[PDB]
Symmetry: D2
Subunit: 474 residues, 4 copies
């Protein structure tokens, strides 16, 4: 078996036990990753903690130089990395190479954003006359050791987005990728190893989350937990963090609200791209259409037609719709599909599953009584919900426990802004599908979708604290 | 004669000579103000300069308290002050009490904005590794003595908007109101006298600009010149400032661009209010309408009708259209009117002048060959210029030497934003008339409309410099 | 008994049950406060949640006006409130009126800071060329309902510091004061009632934390938990918060690091004031002195002498040392004293307790083996720990689980700055005692001393999130 | 003769007439640069104005890529460029290569600082209730065409420091190097040509300032003048700019204030390095020592001794002291030396001139009556002025018409900060010589030393304006 190793204190280490990884589309063995023991996790953390002071003592520009080197290596190796990633998570080849390119971009951008971090000088005389000579010189400091946890759908990009902002600020890292995506995670580690960051500054941890997951999070060496994944795990992490800071990006059931004055063709095009990209396996995917009754029939017909042009098949063929991550997930999606259909929603597409490959399906006239109106599928199934007012759309949208992003399609901008203000989400996109992008923009979820604000500069701010030095001028 | 005095080094001083001021509407004598000599100007400046160190030595909170007190005195005396102001500049009574209230508002806002001025800490390590222990502690400092010069149309407001931002930062002020408005100016000075700011911190200068103007500006005591007035004087101030910092708020020929999808009734209403407020004697007034041909006839008709609803008459009666500030001004407006008429423009309203009271006029079919298409009238005359494309509208708009603000009336917001990027102006108002409005918002002009950025925090920033203290941490 | 009521949805409500409050110094009964039931807590939250949308819909300026009005009432009532406060928490009368004045100040500052909150515009083109016309318009929004919990040592100030930053931003409040201080907290509520903030916008909750404590925190209506108090409770709150945002201000064991070149008289004076203020019942008190051996004897002598000049007695008599909050507390302190003494520490002052009034004690030759070297007493006892190097002082300082603040006394500033960087605390005061002081300055603790950054603007930032609206310019 | 060409609208152009350039140290011909006609200047400007809209239309990221490319070429050719720069301005070889490296750094830093420029969203509701739904979306825009003028002492570095901040923001450039330094300036142009910036975006102008100088500055195509040079020329530019924005970095006579508690060795080392670097031809050089009488003799001795260790000779030999830029300059410097000597100052070094190579001279006991007390020499001559108090030092320091920077040598930092606040300079360095670096730090002069703030981000802000888009949310 092709045995991958964790990167720990500047060395590559195998564990006594291993986890075999297979390609979700083909079933072919891809290799194995170590199933670390708690003692091995202890050594990672002790290694990072010992390296943190010297890493922090370096100048910002030196830390940036290291990150830029990592990003360069990723650019050079985008085809190598994308080829494996594509197979590991059944993501289209081109899309996987793209994920790597975006990872380098984020890493470069963080290096440069974090190198310009500035402090502030506050005046005691702003608050009290007797303190007019007292000033506070406030500078950012790292929180310490960051634990970064990435999800299967972007095992590399959503690791980089946490890692680089943490590192530029002087924090050290322990990176835990998802098990299905742990090889891609270790391929990312290679870049950090080749770049030559000092030993202990960047480290990886592998093993089943269901077995070492609580241990890595509960560990007292961890000063900050930065996680992307399911709402269920994220809730547990919230509790295990206790009073430690956290960044959580979790599930979504993003609504796309369509008013009577919408450009229906632009709406359908965006809805299709956002709903079906990566077979619906995105947190920010359009996951429910709240369309005013009067334009529904026309919009639905455009969606239906565009759904039929989606290619279906294998990762290597760059199909729009690839097989889902695993059996469990495809099973859960099919149950949601059956529930909708059994309850009487109107399927505009054929219901078909072959292995873990579910064919894209559109359900019209979905009601609040159907599971599919609420649950995040993470499969290529889209419900259309007909509404009779914008007030109803807002109510249905906000009734969700999720609040990541929303899309509003209309030609009435000032009104779209007024509706945005009422939507319990992080980001509202006007006349475009929802998306995390562009990476400098804030990325956050309301309610059960998240805690903390991401996007580059916000991640850096999240993973630093402040040191105030106060003195009197003579 | 009721003889007003200047506030100088905490005392009220008369001069050897005086200028009699008369009410523009009734011709009635209002009072007289001193006609200062160059030596008296010298004394104002030497007093201010002497007081500056101790005024800067106060805490921000102490300066803010003085400022809030001034604002409170203004609120208490709004009727007293607005009554005289109304008579001094032929401004509607209610509008004049309104100018005083806005002055108190700007003053209070500036006090609280300026008290929260923060500095920054920069890292040597952001730029070079060898300087990682070097930091720069950067704090704002006043420029010193500010010369504030207000125009006739807002003698009190456009004085407070310069003074309060100047003073909160620790600068000292020498305020020169316009001659026609100097009494109002001196009434404002009373508020500062009663608030009890230390002697020399705030002072006034009176005399004819055409005689002491160059002297007060060229004086080497002055560290900053903040002026609102004609483009003509503004240009001379630019040259006489030499390398000293300046704030110039000059004229405008604000265009109101009307697209085919505009809401015509809203457009007309905003156009009427913006073009005719204070008989068009505002820098930010809507001064030319660039309207798409297809909707022109309809929009023209609406404006015509609303023009007839405008009241005409005296200040005490709160008429919309009051007599112009002076003969010269009315004579200049009549010249533009005749040039447009004699060139073929269609006057939809009756051309009539009685004394200095000119009746509101709407001119249609104004071409680029007419003076009125370009020159700022400072009178109740509106030109309508029909275009056949947005591109044409943009070209014409930008062909002006002025560039204060523009209005865009459309229901296509993203396009409005795209257009706003191309307009050579400081502020673009979408579906609203142009306006200095909301004093916290930036206020600036491109090309011949200004230098520097106003609006509260921007004024504060303009009238402060920075003092950087660099040292190495051990 | 005088039976106080809670302010709930615009009404003053009593509960079935009540808790009787007694003066700690005299034992006299002060009155009673309600002991709310879980259903009454539910009513408070349901009322707040209902009032929130309309409170948010107001303009910043309107919410600020409400806040200023509250602070005005507090200034008017400072003696009435300080009188009771003094009795309820055995705080010197002048100190008590002072806390109320500081509260009004914090409230006004927050109103004015919060009203000026600004959003940002981010460019897609900063990150990717293809997104050059995409922009993000990011504005702050409230989190919703904030649960504010104040401690006994500043029941009113540490309530206002949470309340106003919360309300200015558009959040609603549920304030729970400490039981011993609940009357004072309810007196604060009177001001909010008189100010006339809409019903449900501001509400109080009373009851023993040990009984409704978890219930109020765990309630799903609460969107943010802002707490000051013990580290033990803070930890539990962190766990009960799950993934909801929190602000925790907990214990401290602030060290005062004295170098050989220190100004011993200045040092001694600051050490006395910080250590003994309010009988050592402040989170930020100087709690351990880490003095270089060579200057120890001289410094210790100066402290010893100054301790003897402290007044001991009742609240009404503005004594420096008042009786401790309760018996339990004084018993805890006495156990620390006995442990130090039994272990070999040299008490330079007499050990004496009468009721709950403990006389100020100076322990010299304290070792790391003594409980007093580590545990926060919250009583008038100061240990002196002699070190032989700055490095040692840094080690011992950082060895603590607390990290609120630190003092450094030296004439070598650049070195003091270098030491500050290494100290695991929020704020380092150079040549001054530690202090939350100047409320505009950031206030935070590292390690077990806290979570989140307080200080006005920081609290506002903490209790708001962002809403990003993204669109493409055409 | 090696004929250099100007880079204009993407082409390399010769002029009818040329200027021959000779090496200041050897007298050897170096090459010739064009002597442009007013018409050729007109073509540069028309070219840039035409290229501007399309350069602005690019994304920030694309403009940054071009700049980064330019920086890359400069690094690649640092020896080639430094070799000629060294010869052209008689700057030591390594120092010349060092100037090129610093230019690449500044270009890269500006590229990345500029790409992250963000806008602001202001709320009408902060100022007035009625305007609660109105917001201002404020974004930076370029000013248009920037005229950049560099000085002989850093013909390349002080070109790049103006050019890159201008270009990243979307401005176009016309670069006029100094005549003595025009070759190096054209070498810099080569890197912009090789980077492939579109035609007209970056252009050069060569000719004698005394002949086309006023022309290039008065030209109405120029939207901003960014100049580093003599105070004499800078004053004329101030006037010629009229109301157009400017950045002026002029002369300095930086004082190094030495207190009784100074570390005399560190003080002498810094004084020697700052005063004699590049033979005193630096705006930020230490130009006058204001030393407390009691430590004077000891400091003076240290300086005297360190002055003798300075190498004197040719550029190619990397001598500390090289020949001055020209005869006129060395003649001027000699006159200042003679005045000081004739007036009775104590020369601690021999007075010696061979060609234009003046040996480093230290004059003690300099009195306010000597020209050398006040005039900026731009030669290797240093006056020591003895004082009896810090107040006297401050008075003598501020009595100068220059106020670029100051140095304070002391072991009492809080006092140094109090002294800094009083010094009329832009930057005060504590226990270090004055210097423009690090380049992210602000760089500005008070009084006759400058107008505007430089240092990377400040340069970017100076050369951009704001476009405000106001609208009402529905
Ligand atoms: N388009 C037009 O024909 C027209 C006509 C009238 C007004 N306006 C407009 O009026 C607004 C300001 O009006 P304004 O007539 O009060 O402007 P202004 O005559 O330029 O004067 C504004 C201020 O500058 C002072 N001043 C005059 N000469 C000066 C000098 N040499 N040096 C220093 N200060 C000097 C004035 O004092 P004195 O009052 O003592 O002169 C007054 O306080 C601008 O928008 C301008 O467009 C335009
Ligand atoms: N060094 C010590 O051992 C010691 C002793 C006391 C205080 N302190 C310090 O003083 C500060 C805290 O003062 P404090 O004694 O007032 O502390 P505290 O008991 O933790 O309580 C602070 C606030 O939290 C409330 N609370 C108590 N239990 C709660 C629960 N389960 N859930 C939610 N809220 C709950 C309290 O209400 P109730 O009043 O109803 O309980 C009070 O309002 C910190 O420095 C701590 O270090 C230290
Ligand atoms: N006080 C003194 O007597 C003295 C003497 C030497 C140096 N300095 C110091 O020298 C530094 C500047 O060096 P520098 O000698 O290169 O200064 P400078 O002669 O003022 O020239 C700086 C730049 O200005 C250009 N220039 C000259 N006349 C101009 C005009 N009318 N309009 C526009 N641009 C014009 C120059 O081109 P050309 O090269 O073709 O003219 C040059 O690139 C400052 O620190 C200054 O204080 C002072």
């Amino acid at each position: 078996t092709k045995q991958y190793k964790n990167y720990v204190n500047g060395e590559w280490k195998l564990s006594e036990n291993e986890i075999k990884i297979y390609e979700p589309a083909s079933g072919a063995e891809l290799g194995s990753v170590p199933a670390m023991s708690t003692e091995e996790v202890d050594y990672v953390y002790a290694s990072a903690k010992k390296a943190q002071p010297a890493w922090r003592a370096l100048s910002y520009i030196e830390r940036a130089a290291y990150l830029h080197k990592v990003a360069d290596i990723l650019m050079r190796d985008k085809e190598k990395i994308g080829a494996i990633l594509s197979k590991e998570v059944a993501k289209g080849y081109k899309s996987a190479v793209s994920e790597v390119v975006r990872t380098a971009e984020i890493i470069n951008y963080a290096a440069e954003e974090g190198l310009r971090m500035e402090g502030e000088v506050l005046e005691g005389g702003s608050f009290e006359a007797a303190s007019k000579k007292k000033i506070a010189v406030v500078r950012r400091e790292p929180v310490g050791l960051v634990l970064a946890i990435s999800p299967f759908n972007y095992p590399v990009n959503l690791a980089g987005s946490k890692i680089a902002p943490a590192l530029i600020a002087g924090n050290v890292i322990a990176f835990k990728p998802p098990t299905q995506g742990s090889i891609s995670g270790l391929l990312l580690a290679e870049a950090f190893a080749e770049a030559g960051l000092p030993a202990g500054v960047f480290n990886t941890i592998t093993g089943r989350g269901s077995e070492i997951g609580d241990y890595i999070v509960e560990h007292q060496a961890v000063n900050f937990i930065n996680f992307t994944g399911s709402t269920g795990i994220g809730e547990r992490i919230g509790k295990m963090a206790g009073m430690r800071p956290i960044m959580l990006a979790l599930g979504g059931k993003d609504s796309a609200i369509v008013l009577e004055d919408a450009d229906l063709e632009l709406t359908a095009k965006n809805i299709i791209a956002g709903a079906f990209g990566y077979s619906g396996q995105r947190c920010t995917a359009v996951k429910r259409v709240l369309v005013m009754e009067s334009v529904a029939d026309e919009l639905v017909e455009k969606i239906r037609e565009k759904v039929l042009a989606l290619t279906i098949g294998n990762p290597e063929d760059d199909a729009d719709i690839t097989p889902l991550i695993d059996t469990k997930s495809a099973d859960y999606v099919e149950g949601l599909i059956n529930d909708a259909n059994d309850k009487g929603a109107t399927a505009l597409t054929e219901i078909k599953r072959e292995g873990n490959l579910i064919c894209p399906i559109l359900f019209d006239k979905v009601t609040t009584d159907m599971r599919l109106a609420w649950e995040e599928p993470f499969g290529p199934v889209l419900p259309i919900i007909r509404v009779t007012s914008v007030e109803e759309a807002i109510e249905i949208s906000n009734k969700s426990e999720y609040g990541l992003q929303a899309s509003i399609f209309t030609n009435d901008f000032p009104r779209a802004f007024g509706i945005a203000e009422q939507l319990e989400v992080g980001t509202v996109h006007i006349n475009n599908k929802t998306q995390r992008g562009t990476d400098n923009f804030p990325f956050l979820g309301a309610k059960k979708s998240g805690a903390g604000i991401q996007g580059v500069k916000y991640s850096i701010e999240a993973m630093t604290t402040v040191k105030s030095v106060v003195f009197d001028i003579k």
